[PDB]
Amino acid sequence: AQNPNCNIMIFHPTKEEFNDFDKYIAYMESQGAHRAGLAKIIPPKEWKARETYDNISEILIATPLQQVASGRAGVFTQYHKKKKAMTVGEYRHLANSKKYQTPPHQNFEDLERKYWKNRIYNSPIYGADISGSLFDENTKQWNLGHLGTIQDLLEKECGVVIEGVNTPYLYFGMWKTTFAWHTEDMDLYSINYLHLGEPKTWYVVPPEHGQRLERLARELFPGSSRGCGAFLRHKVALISPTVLKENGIPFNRITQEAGEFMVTFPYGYHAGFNHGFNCAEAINFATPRWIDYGKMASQCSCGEARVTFSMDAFVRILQPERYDLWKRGQ
Ligand SMILES: O=C(CCCc1ccccc1)Nc1cnccc1C(=O)O
Ligand SMILES: [Fe+2]
Ligand SMILES: [Zn+2]
C-alpha cells in the first residue's frame, strides 16, 4: 500500500509528463496520492495558464456573497447573504480596503491562528461559482476548460449516453472567505488552479476516514443533522483543526499558492480559506475509479443543496433507487 499515512503529496511533472492529464492522475494514484484526499501539482517551469492577468477587471461578479458566521470560533455555520453585483476591479479594491485586507502577520501559521480565532467576528464577501475560464485558448496542457467531460467518462465506462455539459467556475476571494467542509457533488474529483493573488489554505480528511468526520459533524451540528442526512452538502459547516484534533479526526493541511494546481479525490472531505485577494478556477472531473464512489454518494433531498442540471443524469443512472426521492427533494 502506497502512502499509508495518507499524507498530502506534492508532484512536479516535467513538460513531457504534463501532456496527458488522465495518465498523470493515474500515475499520482499509483503513488497513493488519493489516500490523502488532496494532492498538489506544481506545473512545469515552462508552462503558463495565460499571458497576463492585466485585463480581468471587467469580469462581473453578478452575485457576491457575504459570508455571515454563527456559532463559536472553532465550530460554526456560515450563511451566504446576496449582495449587489460588482466588477472584479471593484471587488479587488474592496478586498484591499482597510475593512477587508489581510492583517499584519508573521507567517502562514500566524495567519491560520488569526483566521480561526477571528473568522466568526467578520463577514467577508466571496465572488464564488462564476461560470467561466481564465485559461488562454491556446494553453494546451491542464486547461481546465478543455478537459474531458464527466458525461463522456460515464458514457465510456457504462455505455450510456446522457445529457449535460460541465464547465469551469471562477472564484474571487479575499481574506477570511471560506469554503466549508464538503465532498464534491456525486463524490467527484475536483481540480483547482490558483490563477493569481494571495494563497488558499486547505484542510482535508482521507477518504477512508470520511465517515469519522461525518459522525463528528452530526454531533457538532445536531439541528442541521436532524434536518438533512447529508447536510454537509449544504456547504455551511466549519470545524477548526483544533476541534478535529480534540476529537481524533485524521486530517492534513496545506497551502496552495498562485500558479499551483490542487486536485481533490473522490470522497475527500475538504475545507479552507483565502489569505487575501485572489482568483481560482475549478471544475469537477471523473476517472474510471470514480464510478464506484458515484454509486455510493450521499444525496441531499431536503431541498437546501444546489443541484446542477448535470447531476440529474448522474443520480438517474448511478442511483436509480434514490432518483425519485432526490428529484422531489428539489
Ligand atoms: O465551495 C466553494 C465555494 C462555496 C460555494 C457555495 C456554497 C454555499 C452557497 C453558495 C456558494 N469553494 C470551494 C470548494 N472546494 C474547493 C475549493 C473551493 C474554493 O473556494 O476555492
Ligand atoms: Fe470542493
Ligand atoms: Zn439537505
Curated annotation (Swiss-Prot):
Q: How is it modified after translation?
A: Ubiquitinated via 'Lys-63'-linked ubiquitin chains. Deubiquitinated by USP14 with the help of TRIM14 leading to stabilization.
This entry carries the following GO cellular component terms, namely:
blood microparticle; chromatin; nucleoplasm; nucleus; pericentric heterochromatin; site of double-strand break
Where is 2-oxoglutarate bound in this sequence? Y126, N192, K200, K235
Q: Name the chemical reaction catalysed here.
A: N(6),N(6),N(6)-trimethyl-L-lysyl(9)-[histone H3] + 2 2-oxoglutarate + 2 O2 = N(6)-methyl-L-lysyl(9)-[histone H3] + 2 formaldehyde + 2 succinate + 2 CO2
Q: Where does Zn(2+) bind?
A: C228, H234, C300, C302
Q: What is the lineage of its organism?
A: Eukaryota, Metazoa, Chordata, Craniata, Vertebrata
Which positions carry PolyADP-ribosyl glutamic acid?
Answer: E16, E17
Tell me which species this is from: Homo sapiens
Q: What is this protein called?
A: Lysine-specific demethylase 4D
Cofactor section: Fe(2+)
